[PDB]
Amino acid sequence: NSVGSTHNVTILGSGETTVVLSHGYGTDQSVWKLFVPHLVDDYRVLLYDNMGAGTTNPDYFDFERYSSLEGYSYDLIAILDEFHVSKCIFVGHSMSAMAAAVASIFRPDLFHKLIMISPSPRLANAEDYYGGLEQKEIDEVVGSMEENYRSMALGSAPLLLACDLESAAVQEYCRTLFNMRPDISCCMARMIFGLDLRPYLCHVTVPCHILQSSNDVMVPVAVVEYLSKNLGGPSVVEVMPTEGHLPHLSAPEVTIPVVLRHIRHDI
């Protein structure tokens, strides 16, 4: 089976330039359903599911491979090569944006620019670094998701999204979160909370467009300022007038025009 097939790769639209849409944790490629209609007329849109999404087969989830971000970077490279991609416009959420940043160190030929929605190089606090969460809180969260996965997913969704419980956004996010096998989901969460890309930002040279919500519980604004300062190539930060950690999901009316502008215009 090709890597594209096992990741449910979808090609929509048509064009000389490829826009790659890469969902983040707890979602699948359906997270982009309201964005796609705005892209298909002008671009070849490539979407795929990260290994471990509920739409993927657990037989392909190698717990060791996906306990480090490079497993996701390598899958991205393999999929883009299977589709003969050169210099794509990549759009990712959070750690899928960081997986592309890592991939671009290995394979800058694949990326014209990275559009990164709510990214962080390190979610955990460290000495002289405020990432957002103490290691002990991360331990509690990961322990809670082992205890009652679905209870924790529902309890966290409104806070992560900055949306009310009864909203379409919370309903959609819980649908995909609950679709993941709990052990796979915990493995991915542990990887995400343990990632520290701070030493490697200076090696990223592709242009990076950082799209930040106005209030993200997972990403303090100083973290995106730190990310932009330390990236090795061109970068820009745009703070959008909507809250939460998944603004593409919760507020497409704000986030779609911003994403389109960053797709259409280089730094």
Which residues neighbour 91 within 8 Å (Cβ) at sequence distance 6 or greater? 19, 20, 21, 22, 115, 117, 259, 263
d(CA 141, CA 120): 18
Closest-CA residue to 39 (of 90, 106, 4):
90
* Tokens linked to 260: 């389109």
**Sign of the four-CA dihedral 50, 69, 177, 226:** negative
Catalytic residue IDs: 94, 216, 245
Give the alpha-carbon dihedral of 169, 79, 101, 24, to 10 degrees: 20
d(CA 45, CA 158): 30
Q: How was this structure determined?
A: X-ray
10-13/44-48 β-pairing: antiparallel
d(CA 190, CA 176): 18
Burial of 221 (0-12, 13-18, 19+ CB in 10 A): middle
List, in sequence order, the alpha helices (H) in 111-220: 135-147, 149-161, 168-178, 182-194
Other beta carbons within 10 angstroms of residue 195's beta carbon come to 19
Contact (Cβ atoms closer than 8 angstroms) between residue 230 and residue 197? no
Resolution for the entry shown, Å: 1.4
Terminal alpha carbon distance of the chain: 39
The amino acid sitting at 209 is H
Q: State whether residue 3 is helix, strand or coil.
A: helix
Residue with tokens 């794509």: 88
Which residues neighbour 30 within 8 Å (Cβ) at sequence distance 6 or greater? 176
- Angle value at C-alpha 210, between 49 and 55, nearest 5 degrees: 10
Set out the domains of the chain in order of their start, with CATH numbers.
Answer: 1-267 (3.40.50.1820)
Burial of 14 (0-12, 13-18, 19+ CB in 10 A): exposed
Contact (Cβ atoms closer than 8 angstroms) between residue 9 and residue 34? no
- Angle value at C-alpha 53, between 47 and 58, nearest 5 degrees: 120
Contact (Cβ atoms closer than 8 angstroms) between residue 65 and residue 71? yes
Give the alpha-carbon dihedral of 43, 266, 30, 247, to 10 degrees: -150
Q: How many residues does the chain have?
A: 267
Angle between helix 135-147 and 149-161 (nearest 10): 130
